[PDB]
Amino acid sequence: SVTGGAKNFNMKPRLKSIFRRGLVKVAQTTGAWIITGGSHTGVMKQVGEAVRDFSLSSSYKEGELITIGVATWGTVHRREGLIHPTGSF
Amino acid sequence: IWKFQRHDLIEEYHGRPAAPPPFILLSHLQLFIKRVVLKRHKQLKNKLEKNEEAALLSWEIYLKENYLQNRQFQQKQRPEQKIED
Predict the structure, then answer these.
(1) Which of A42, A66, B8, B37 holds its CA 20 to 30 A away from the CA of A77?
(2) C-alpha to C-alpha distance for A71 and A44, rounded to whole angstroms
């Protein structure tokens, strides 16, 4: 479970390097479950990008590093389109 | 040098039409009237799609750093480097 700064986050390049190799390398072998906050800002964006390019560069490899995000229902921008009374399949 | 020289004949014969020289005139008239009234093959040169090209560029630029790490790693293993260390 990775946590960090959401809206006001700044990082040196050396810190950026560990997310690309250290977090992804230790996530991809063991078959982990990266759980984090669901947001497009800050550190969660860094995890979201650094897990995406692995799936492209995997060259049709089996399995994907599964990622589950948890955020509050209140602070969502366009959630009025999400509420469907029937099963929004 | 022979492996290098292999290319250009294949280039020519891809460029050369398929009719034998007894019958190359049928192609010759059509090409001459085509250039009279009005382009390489796509199998050698092609403007790709830009979004496809961006995906390709991101792919190779991802692989570049994967090359570089093992490159400098094995370059650390020369004995002069261990002497300096």
Answers:
(1) A66
(2) 11
Q: For chains A and B, what is the number of CB pairs under 8 angstroms?
A: 9
Best CA proximity match to A45, nearest among A87, A89, A2, A82 = A2
Resolution, given in Å to one decimal, reads: 4.4
- Method used to solve the structure: cryo-EM
Q: What are the chain B neighbours of A53 within 8 Å (beta carbons)?
A: 58, 62
Enumerate the H helices of chain A as residue ranges.
13-18, 24-30, 43-57
Q: Is A63 left (phi over 0), alpha (psi -120 to 50) or beta?
A: left
The dihedral through the CA atoms of A46, A48, A49, A50 has a sign that is positive
- What pairing do the DSSP bridges indicate for beta strands A67-70 and A34-37? parallel
- Decide if A87 contacts A70 (C-beta within 8 A): no
- Sequence-distant (6+) residues with CB within 8 A of A73 are A79
Q: Which of A54, A67, A64 is nearest to A24 (CA)?
A: A54
